[PDB]
Coordinates of C-alpha atoms in Angstrom, one line a residue:
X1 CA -114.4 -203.1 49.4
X2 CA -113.8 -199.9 51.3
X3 CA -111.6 -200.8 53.7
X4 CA -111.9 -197.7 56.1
X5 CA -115.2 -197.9 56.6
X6 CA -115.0 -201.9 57.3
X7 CA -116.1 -204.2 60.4
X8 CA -112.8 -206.2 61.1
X9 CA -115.4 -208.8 60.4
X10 CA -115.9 -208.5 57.1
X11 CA -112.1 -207.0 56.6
X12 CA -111.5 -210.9 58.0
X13 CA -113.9 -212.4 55.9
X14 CA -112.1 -211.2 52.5
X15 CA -108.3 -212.0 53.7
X16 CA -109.4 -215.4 54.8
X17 CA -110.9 -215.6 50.8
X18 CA -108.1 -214.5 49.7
X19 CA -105.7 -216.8 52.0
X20 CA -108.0 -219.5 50.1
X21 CA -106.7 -218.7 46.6
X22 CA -103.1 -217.9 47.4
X23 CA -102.7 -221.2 49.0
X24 CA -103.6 -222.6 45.5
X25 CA -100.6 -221.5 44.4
X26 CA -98.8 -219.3 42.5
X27 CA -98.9 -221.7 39.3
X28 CA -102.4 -222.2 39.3
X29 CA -103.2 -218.5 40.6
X30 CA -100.7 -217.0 38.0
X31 CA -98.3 -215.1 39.0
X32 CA -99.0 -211.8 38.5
X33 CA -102.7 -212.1 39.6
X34 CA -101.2 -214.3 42.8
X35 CA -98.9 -210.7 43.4
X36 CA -101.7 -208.7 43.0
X37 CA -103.6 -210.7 45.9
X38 CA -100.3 -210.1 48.0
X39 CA -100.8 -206.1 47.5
X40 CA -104.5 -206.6 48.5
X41 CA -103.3 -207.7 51.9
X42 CA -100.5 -205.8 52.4
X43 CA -102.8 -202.4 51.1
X44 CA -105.4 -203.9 53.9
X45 CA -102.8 -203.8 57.0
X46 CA -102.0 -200.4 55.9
X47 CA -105.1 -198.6 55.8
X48 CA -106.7 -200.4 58.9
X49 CA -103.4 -199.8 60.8
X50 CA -102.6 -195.9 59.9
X51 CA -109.6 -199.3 65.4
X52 CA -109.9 -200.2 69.0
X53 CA -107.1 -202.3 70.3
X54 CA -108.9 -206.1 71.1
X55 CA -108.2 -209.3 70.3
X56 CA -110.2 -209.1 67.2
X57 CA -108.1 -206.3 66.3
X58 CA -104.9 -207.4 67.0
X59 CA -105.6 -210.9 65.1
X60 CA -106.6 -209.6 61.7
X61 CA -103.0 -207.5 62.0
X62 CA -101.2 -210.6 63.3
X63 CA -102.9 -212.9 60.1
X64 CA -102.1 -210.2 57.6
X65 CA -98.9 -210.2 58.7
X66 CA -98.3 -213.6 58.5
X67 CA -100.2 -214.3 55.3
X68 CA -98.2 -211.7 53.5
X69 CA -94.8 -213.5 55.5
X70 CA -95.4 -216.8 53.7
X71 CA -96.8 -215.4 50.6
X72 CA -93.5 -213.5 50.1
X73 CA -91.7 -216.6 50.8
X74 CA -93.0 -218.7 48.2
X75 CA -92.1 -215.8 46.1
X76 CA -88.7 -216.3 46.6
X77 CA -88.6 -220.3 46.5
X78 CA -90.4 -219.7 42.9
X79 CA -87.2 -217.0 42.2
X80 CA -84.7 -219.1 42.9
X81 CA -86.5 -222.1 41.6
X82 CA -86.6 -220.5 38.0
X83 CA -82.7 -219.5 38.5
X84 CA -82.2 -222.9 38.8
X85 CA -84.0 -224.3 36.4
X86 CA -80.2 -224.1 34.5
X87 CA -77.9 -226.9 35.5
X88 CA -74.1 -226.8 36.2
X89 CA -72.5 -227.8 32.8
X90 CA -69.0 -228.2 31.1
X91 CA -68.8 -225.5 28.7
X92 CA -65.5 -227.2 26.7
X93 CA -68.5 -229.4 25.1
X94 CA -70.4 -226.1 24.0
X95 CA -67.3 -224.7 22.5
X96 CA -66.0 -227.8 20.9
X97 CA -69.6 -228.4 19.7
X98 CA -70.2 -224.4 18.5
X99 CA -73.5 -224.2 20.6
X100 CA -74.3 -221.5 22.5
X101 CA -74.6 -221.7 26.3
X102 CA -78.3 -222.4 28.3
X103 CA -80.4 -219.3 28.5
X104 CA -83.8 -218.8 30.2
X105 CA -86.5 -218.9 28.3
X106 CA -88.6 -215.4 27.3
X107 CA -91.3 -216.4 30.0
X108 CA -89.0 -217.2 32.6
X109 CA -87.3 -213.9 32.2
X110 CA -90.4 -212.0 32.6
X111 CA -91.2 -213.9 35.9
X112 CA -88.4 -213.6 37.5
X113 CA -88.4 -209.4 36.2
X114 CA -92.2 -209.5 37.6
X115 CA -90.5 -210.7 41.1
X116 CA -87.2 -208.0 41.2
X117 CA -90.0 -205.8 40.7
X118 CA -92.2 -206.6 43.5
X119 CA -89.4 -207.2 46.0
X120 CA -87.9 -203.6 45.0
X121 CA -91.4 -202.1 45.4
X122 CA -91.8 -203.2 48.8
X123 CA -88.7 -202.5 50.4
X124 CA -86.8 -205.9 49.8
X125 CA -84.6 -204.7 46.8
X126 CA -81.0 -205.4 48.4
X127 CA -82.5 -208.6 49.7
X128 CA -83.9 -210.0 46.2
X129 CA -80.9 -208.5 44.5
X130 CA -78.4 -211.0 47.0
X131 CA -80.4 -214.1 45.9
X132 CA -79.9 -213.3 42.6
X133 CA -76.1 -213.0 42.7
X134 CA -76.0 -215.6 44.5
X135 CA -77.7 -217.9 42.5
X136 CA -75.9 -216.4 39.5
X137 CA -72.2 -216.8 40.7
X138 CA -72.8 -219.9 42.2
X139 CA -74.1 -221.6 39.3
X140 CA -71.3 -220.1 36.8
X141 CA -69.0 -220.7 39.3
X142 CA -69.9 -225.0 38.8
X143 CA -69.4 -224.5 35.4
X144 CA -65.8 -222.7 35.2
X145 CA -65.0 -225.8 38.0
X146 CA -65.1 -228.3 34.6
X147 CA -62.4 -226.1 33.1
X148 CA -60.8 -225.3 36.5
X149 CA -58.7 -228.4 36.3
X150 CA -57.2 -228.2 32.9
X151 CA -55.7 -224.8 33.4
X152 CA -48.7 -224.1 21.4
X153 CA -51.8 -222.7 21.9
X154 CA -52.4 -226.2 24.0
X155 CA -52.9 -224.8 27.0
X156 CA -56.2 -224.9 28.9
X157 CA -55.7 -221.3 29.9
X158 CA -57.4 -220.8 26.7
X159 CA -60.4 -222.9 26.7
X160 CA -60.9 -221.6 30.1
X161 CA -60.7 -217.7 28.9
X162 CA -62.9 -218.5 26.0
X163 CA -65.4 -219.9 28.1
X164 CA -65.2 -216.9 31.0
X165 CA -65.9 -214.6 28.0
X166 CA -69.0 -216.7 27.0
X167 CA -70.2 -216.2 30.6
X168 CA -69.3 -212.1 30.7
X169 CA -71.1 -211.7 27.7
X170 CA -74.2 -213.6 28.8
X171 CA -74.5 -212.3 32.1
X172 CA -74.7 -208.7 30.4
X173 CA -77.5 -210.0 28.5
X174 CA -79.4 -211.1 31.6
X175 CA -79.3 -208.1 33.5
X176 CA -79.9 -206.1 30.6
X177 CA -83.2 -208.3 30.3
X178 CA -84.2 -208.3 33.8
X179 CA -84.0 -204.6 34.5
X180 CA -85.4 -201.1 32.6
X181 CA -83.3 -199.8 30.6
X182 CA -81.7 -197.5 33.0
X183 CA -82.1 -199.3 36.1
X184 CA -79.1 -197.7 38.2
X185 CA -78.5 -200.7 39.8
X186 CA -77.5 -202.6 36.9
X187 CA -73.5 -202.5 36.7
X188 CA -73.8 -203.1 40.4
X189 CA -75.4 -206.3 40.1
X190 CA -73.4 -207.4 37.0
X191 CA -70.3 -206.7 39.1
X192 CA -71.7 -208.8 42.0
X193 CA -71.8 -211.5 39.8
X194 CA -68.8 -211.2 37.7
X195 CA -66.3 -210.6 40.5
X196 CA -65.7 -213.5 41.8
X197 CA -65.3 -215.3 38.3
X198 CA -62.8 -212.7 38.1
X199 CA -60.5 -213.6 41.4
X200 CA -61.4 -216.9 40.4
X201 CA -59.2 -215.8 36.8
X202 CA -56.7 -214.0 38.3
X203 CA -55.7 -216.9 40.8
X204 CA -55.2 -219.5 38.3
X205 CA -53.2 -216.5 35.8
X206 CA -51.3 -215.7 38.7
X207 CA -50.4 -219.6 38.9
X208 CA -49.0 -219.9 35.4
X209 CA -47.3 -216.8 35.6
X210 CA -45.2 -218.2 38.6
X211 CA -45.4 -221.5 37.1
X212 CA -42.7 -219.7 35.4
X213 CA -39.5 -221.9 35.9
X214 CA -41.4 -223.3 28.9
X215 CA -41.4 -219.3 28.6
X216 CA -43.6 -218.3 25.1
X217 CA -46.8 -219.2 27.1
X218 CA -46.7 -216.1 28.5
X219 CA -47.6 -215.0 24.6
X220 CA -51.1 -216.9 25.1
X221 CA -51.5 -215.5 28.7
X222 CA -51.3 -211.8 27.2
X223 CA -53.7 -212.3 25.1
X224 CA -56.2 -214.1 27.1
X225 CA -56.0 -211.5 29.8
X226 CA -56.6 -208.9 27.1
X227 CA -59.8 -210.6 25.8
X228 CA -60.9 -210.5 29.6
X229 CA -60.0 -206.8 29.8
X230 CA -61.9 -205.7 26.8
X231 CA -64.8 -207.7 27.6
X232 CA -65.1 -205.6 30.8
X233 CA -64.9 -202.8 29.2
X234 CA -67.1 -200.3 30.2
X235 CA -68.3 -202.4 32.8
X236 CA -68.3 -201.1 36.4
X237 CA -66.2 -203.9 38.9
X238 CA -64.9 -203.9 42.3
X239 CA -61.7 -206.4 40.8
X240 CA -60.4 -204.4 38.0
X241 CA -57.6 -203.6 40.2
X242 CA -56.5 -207.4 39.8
X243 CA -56.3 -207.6 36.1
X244 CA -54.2 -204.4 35.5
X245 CA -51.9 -206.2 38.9
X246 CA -52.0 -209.4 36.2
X247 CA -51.4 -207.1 33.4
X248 CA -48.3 -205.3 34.6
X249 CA -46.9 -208.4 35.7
X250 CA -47.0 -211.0 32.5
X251 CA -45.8 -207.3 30.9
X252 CA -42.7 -207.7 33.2
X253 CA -42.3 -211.3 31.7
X254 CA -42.9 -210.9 28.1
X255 CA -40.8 -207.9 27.7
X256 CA -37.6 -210.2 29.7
X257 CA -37.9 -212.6 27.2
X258 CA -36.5 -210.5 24.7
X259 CA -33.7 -209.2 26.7
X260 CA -32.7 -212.7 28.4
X261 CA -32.6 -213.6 24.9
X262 CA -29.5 -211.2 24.3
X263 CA -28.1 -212.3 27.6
X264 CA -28.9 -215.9 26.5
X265 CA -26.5 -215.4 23.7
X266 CA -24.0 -213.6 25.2
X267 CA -23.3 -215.9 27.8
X268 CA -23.6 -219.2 25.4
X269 CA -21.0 -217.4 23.1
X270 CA -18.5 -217.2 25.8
X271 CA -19.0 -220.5 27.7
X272 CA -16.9 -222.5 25.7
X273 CA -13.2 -220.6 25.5
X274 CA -12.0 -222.4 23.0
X275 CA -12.8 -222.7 19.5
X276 CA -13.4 -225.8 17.1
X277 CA -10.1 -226.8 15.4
X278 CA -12.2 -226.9 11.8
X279 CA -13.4 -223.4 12.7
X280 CA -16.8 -224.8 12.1
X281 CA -20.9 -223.8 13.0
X282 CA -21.1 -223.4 17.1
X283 CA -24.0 -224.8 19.4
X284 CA -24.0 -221.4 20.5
X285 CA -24.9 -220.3 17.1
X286 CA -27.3 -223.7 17.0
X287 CA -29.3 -223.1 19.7
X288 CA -29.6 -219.3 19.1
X289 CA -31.2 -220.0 16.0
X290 CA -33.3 -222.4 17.3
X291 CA -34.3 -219.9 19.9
X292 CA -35.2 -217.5 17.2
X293 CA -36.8 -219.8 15.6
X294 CA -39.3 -220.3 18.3
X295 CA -39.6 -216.7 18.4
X296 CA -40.6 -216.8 14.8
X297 CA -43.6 -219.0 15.3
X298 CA -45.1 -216.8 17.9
X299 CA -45.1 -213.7 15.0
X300 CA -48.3 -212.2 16.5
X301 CA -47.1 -212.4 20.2
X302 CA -44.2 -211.0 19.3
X303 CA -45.3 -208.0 17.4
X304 CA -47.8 -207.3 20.4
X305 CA -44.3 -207.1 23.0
X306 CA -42.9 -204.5 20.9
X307 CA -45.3 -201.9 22.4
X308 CA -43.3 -200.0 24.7
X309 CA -40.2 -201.9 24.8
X310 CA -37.4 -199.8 23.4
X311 CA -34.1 -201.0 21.9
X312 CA -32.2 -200.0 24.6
X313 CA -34.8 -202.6 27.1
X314 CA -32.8 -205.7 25.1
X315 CA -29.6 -204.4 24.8
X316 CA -26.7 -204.3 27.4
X317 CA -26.4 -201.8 29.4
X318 CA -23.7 -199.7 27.9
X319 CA -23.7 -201.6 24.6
X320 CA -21.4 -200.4 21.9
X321 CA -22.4 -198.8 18.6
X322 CA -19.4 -200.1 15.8
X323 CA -20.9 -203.9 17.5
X324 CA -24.1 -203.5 16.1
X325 CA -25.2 -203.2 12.1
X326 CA -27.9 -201.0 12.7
X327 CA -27.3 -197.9 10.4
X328 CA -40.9 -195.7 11.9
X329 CA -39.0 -196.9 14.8
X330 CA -42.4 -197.3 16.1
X331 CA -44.4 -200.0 14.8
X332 CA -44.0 -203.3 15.9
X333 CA -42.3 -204.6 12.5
X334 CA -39.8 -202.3 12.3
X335 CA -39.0 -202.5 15.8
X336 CA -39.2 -206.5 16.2
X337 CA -36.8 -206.4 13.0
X338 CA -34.4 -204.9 15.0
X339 CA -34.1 -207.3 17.6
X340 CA -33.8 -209.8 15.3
X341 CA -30.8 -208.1 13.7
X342 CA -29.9 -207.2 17.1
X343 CA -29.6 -211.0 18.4
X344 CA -27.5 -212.3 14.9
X345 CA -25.1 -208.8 16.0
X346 CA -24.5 -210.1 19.1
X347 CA -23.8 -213.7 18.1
X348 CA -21.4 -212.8 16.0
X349 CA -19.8 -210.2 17.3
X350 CA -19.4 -212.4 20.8
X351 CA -18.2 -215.2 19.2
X352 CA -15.6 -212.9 17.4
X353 CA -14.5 -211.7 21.2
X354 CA -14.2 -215.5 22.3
X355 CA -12.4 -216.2 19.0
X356 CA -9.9 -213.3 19.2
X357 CA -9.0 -214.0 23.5
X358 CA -8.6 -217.6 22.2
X359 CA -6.3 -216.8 19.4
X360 CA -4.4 -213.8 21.2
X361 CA -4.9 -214.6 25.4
X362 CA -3.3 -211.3 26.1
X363 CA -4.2 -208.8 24.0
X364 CA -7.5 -206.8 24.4
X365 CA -10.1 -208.0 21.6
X366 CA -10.8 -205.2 18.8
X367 CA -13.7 -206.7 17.2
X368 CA -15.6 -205.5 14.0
X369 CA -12.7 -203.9 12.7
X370 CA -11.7 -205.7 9.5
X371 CA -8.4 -203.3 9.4
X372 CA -7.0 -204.1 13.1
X373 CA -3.0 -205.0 12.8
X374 CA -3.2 -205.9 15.8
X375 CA -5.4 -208.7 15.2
X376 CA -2.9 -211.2 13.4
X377 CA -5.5 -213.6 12.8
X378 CA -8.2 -212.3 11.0
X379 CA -8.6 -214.2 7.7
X380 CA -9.0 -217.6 10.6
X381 CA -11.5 -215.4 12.6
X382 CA -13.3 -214.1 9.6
X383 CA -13.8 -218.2 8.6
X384 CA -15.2 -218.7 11.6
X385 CA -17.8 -216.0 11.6
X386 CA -18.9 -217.0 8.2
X387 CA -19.3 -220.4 8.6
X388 CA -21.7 -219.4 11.6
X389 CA -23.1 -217.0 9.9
X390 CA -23.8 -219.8 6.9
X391 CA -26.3 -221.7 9.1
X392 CA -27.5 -218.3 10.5
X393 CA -28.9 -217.4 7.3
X394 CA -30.4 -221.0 6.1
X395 CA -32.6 -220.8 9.4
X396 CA -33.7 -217.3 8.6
X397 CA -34.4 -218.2 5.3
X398 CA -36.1 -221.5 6.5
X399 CA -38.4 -220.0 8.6
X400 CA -40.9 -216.7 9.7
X401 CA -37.7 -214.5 10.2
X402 CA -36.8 -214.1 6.6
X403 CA -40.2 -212.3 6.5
X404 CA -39.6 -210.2 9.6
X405 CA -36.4 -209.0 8.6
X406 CA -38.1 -208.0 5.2
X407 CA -35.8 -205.0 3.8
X408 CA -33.5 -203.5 6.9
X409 CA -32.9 -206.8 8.2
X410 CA -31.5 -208.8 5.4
X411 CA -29.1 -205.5 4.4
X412 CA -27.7 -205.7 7.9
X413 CA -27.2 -209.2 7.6
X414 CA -25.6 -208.4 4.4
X415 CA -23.5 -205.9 6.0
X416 CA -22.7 -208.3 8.7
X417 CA -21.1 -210.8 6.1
X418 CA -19.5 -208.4 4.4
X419 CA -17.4 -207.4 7.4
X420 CA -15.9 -210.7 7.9
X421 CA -15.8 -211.5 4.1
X422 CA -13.7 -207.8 4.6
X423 CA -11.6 -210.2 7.6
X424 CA -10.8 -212.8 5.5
X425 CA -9.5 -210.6 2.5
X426 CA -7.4 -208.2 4.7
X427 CA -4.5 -210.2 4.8
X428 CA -4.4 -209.9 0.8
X429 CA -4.6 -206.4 1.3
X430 CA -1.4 -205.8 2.8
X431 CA 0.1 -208.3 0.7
X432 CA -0.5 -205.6 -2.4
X433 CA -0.3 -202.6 -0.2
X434 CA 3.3 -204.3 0.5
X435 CA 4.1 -204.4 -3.2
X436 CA 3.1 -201.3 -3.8
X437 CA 5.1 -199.7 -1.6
X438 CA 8.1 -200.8 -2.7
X439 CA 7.5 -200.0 -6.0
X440 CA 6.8 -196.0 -4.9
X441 CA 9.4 -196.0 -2.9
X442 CA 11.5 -197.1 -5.2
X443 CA 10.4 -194.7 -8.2
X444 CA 11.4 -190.9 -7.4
X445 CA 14.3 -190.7 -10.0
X446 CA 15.3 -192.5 -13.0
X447 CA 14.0 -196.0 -13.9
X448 CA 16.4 -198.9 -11.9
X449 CA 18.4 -201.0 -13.7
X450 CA 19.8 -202.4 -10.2
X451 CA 19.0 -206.1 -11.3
X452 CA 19.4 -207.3 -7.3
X453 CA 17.1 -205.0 -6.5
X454 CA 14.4 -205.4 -8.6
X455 CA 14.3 -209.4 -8.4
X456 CA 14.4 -208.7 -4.5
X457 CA 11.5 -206.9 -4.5
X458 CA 9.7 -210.1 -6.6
X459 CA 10.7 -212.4 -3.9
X460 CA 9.6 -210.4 -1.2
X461 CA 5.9 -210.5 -3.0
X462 CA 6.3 -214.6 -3.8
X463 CA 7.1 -215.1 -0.7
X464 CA 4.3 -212.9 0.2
X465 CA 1.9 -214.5 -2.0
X466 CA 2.9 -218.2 -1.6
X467 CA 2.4 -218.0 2.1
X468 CA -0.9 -216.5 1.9
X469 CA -1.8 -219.2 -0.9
X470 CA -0.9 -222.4 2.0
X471 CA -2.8 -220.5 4.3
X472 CA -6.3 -219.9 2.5
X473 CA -6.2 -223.4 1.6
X474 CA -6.7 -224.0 5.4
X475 CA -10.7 -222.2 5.4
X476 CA -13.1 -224.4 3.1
X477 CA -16.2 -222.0 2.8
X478 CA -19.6 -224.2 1.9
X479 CA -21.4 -220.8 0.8
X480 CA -21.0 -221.0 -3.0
X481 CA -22.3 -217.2 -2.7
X482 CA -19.4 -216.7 -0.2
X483 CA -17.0 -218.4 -2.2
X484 CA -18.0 -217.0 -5.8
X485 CA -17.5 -213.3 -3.7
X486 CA -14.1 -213.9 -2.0
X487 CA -12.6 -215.2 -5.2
X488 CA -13.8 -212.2 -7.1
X489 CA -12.3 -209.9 -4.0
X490 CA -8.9 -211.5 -4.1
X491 CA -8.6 -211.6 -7.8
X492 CA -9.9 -208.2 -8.0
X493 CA -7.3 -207.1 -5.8
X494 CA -3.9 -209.3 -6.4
X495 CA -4.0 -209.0 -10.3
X496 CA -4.3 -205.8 -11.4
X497 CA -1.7 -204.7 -9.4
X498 CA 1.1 -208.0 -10.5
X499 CA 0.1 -207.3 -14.1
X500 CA 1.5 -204.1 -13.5
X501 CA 4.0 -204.7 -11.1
X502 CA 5.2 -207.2 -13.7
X503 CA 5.0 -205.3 -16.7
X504 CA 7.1 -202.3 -15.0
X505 CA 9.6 -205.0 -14.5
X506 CA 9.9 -207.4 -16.6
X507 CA 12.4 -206.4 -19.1
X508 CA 14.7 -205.6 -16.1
X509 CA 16.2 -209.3 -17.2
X510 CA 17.6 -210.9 -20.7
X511 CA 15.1 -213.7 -19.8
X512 CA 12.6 -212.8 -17.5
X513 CA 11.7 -216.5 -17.1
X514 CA 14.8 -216.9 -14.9
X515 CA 14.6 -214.1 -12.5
X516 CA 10.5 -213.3 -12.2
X517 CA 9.1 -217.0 -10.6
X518 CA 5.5 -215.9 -11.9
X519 CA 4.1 -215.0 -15.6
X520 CA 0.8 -212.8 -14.6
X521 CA -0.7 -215.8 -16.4
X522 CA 0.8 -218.4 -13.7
X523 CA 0.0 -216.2 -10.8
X524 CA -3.7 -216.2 -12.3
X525 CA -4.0 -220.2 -12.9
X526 CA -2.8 -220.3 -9.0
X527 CA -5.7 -218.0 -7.6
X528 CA -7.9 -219.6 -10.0
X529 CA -7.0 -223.5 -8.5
X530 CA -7.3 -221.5 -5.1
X531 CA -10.5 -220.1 -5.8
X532 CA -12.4 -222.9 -7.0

């Protein structure tokens, strides 16, 4: 009763009684009522201890003592025994089966709250805290093993993120529901226990991003260490510093990927030096396509790479402006677009360069100038291009890229075909600039009646015409949208000009028929047979 006033008699007396019902234990005492015996004792040592120093003395202090020793004990086999009353399990089952993972039960959470609390009122706070860590991590840790070994969209990187985000999530709960409200302690003790699930992460990410030697995974592995990152959020932890080290580095990867892309096709366009004898579709061209193709199918990983990755991060170092058909450069659409564009530029503007060192060894290559006279072979080149640039477009239009290059894209293409539909019908070009020439130069005075000169000046033109004729026979375009526009260019552009060549000369001759080999109507059925 009043212990300062006590006989260490009768101060034994009642810690033997109560020695009787702790040892009943803490079950069948209850556990609150079983720490509220502990207090008794511990109160008891304290107020008889703040007495004349015999054995009977120094016994009661030695049994208190002890009692309280073993009591405390069975305290914390009761902790951890309600810690453990959750088993080591596979999570892949849970997720696969949509059920949510074990949880203690109301009760069980307030027992083991009831014990934090007693161990942090008498001194033991660190010491209860450890065990409960311990126990924590441990347990989680047997789980993520299950996963462990299994780490598109195949991967087990992901089963193992979804599951780590099941666990971060969860363990937030718990301390939320073991502590007050404000319990300072809290984000310690979360980060106690989350930490090592997070070297455990960053390990097996660091694996797969040197694992590294098919390449879009690294798509997947951005996004599952960006779930990880926002589900710390907010969230004190001594390993942060290894997730933004993870970060940085599959940044480093992802953002190469676009630029070894470019490479990829600048070195596949020049492997071969020569080029087909039918002037046909390229496995350069066949496997960039294919390449952008894959890109395609990763649209959201793809988008998500164009933060902070400029133009100029994907493009050669000093790349050249007239090679390229680019004419908010800050959202991910706009700038994805471009590369897109940007990889079709390079293909054909690479294959041109190959095309024009094979056709002319020693001169320097002038590509994307459809007005070059230096390049003496430009209707031949401009086939070529185009019949790339033929299976180009039924890919794009085949797959996700005719919907990223939605609007600026499909105009450059356009203005990419247009330059080598411009190749093909430069040759035609000088045939009438020719032509015309020699008609101004040879109208300053009165109008000729030099007979000699006149039919000269149409056989210079048939000759002209004829040879061009053989020639264009040579390039078969599949396209009908390329062919329908190159026989409206060369039409557009030889006959005008005969029918007036022709009519300005005609009646030069008694008979026309025997000095002028074409009627405008006979040049036109030729074209026309050409065309087709």
């Amino acid at each position: 009763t009043l212990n300062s006033v006590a006989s260490v008699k009768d101060l034994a007396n009642e810690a033997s009684k109560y020695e009787i019902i702790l040892q009943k234990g803490i079950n069948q005492v209850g556990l609150k009522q079983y720490t509220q015996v502990v207090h008794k004792l511990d109160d008891m040592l304290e107020d008889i201890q703040s007495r004349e120093e015999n054995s009977e003395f120094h016994g009661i202090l030695t049994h208190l003592e002890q009692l309280i020793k073993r009591s405390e004990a069975q305290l914390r086999v009761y902790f951890i025994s309600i810690l453990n009353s959750i088993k080591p399990f596979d999570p892949q089952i849970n997720i696969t089966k949509k059920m949510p993972f074990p949880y203690y039960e109301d009760q069980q959470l307030g027992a083991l709250s009831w014990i934090l609390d007693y161990f942090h009122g008498n001194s033991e706070g660190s010491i209860i805290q450890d065990i409960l860590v311990g126990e924590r991590s441990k347990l989680i840790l047997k789980c993520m093993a299950f996963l462990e070994p299994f780490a598109k969209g195949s991967s087990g990187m992901n089963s193992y993120t979804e599951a780590l985000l099941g666990f971060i999530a969860n363990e937030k709960s718990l301390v939320d529901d073991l502590y007050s409200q404000y319990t300072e302690s809290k984000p310690h003790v979360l980060s106690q226990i989350l930490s090592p699930l997070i070297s455990a992460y960053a390990k097996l990410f660091g694996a797969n991003l040197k694992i590294v030697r098919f390449g879009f995974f690294s798509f997947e592995l951005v996004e599952s260490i960006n779930d990880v990152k926002k589900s710390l959020r907010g969230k004190e932890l001594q390993n942060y510093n290894l997730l933004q080290d993870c970060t940085q580095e599959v940044r480093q990867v992802t953002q190469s990927l676009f630029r070894d892309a470019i490479d990829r096709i600048i070195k596949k366009a020049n492997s071969i030096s020569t080029i087909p004898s039918n002037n046909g579709v390229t496995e350069a061209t066949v496997d960039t396509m294919s390449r952008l193709r894959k890109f395609s199918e990763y649209k959201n990983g793809c988008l998500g790479a164009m933060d902070n990755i400029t133009r100029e991060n994907w493009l050669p170092s000093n790349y050249k402006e007239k090679e390229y058909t680019l004419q908010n450069w800050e959202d991910h659409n706009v700038l994805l677009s471009c590369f897109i564009s940007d990889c079709i530029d390079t293909l054909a503007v690479n294959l041109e360069r190959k095309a024009q060192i094979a056709l002319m060894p020693n001169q320097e290559p002038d590509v994307a100038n459809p007005n070059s006279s230096k390049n003496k072979h430009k209707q031949r080149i401009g086939f070529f291009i185009l019949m790339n640039l033929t299976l180009v477009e039924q890919i794009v239009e085949k797959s996700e890229l005719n919907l990223m290059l939605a609007g600026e894209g499909h105009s450059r293409l356009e203005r990419l075909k247009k330059r080598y539909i411009s190749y093909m019908v430069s040759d035609w070009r000088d045939l009438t600039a020719n032509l015309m020439d020699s008609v101004f130069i040879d109208s300053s005075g009165k109008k000729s009646k030099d007979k000699e000169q006149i039919k000269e000046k149409f056989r210079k033109f048939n000759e002209g015409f004829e040879d061009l004729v053989s020639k264009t026979k040579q390039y078969k375009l599949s396209d009908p949208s390329l062919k329908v526009t190159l026989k409206s260019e060369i039409i557009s552009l030889v006959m005008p000009m005969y029918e007036r060549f022709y009519s300005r000369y005609k009646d030069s001759f008694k008979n026309p028929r025997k000095h002028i080999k074409y009627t405008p109507d006979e040049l036109t059925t030729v074209l026309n047979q050409l065309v087709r």
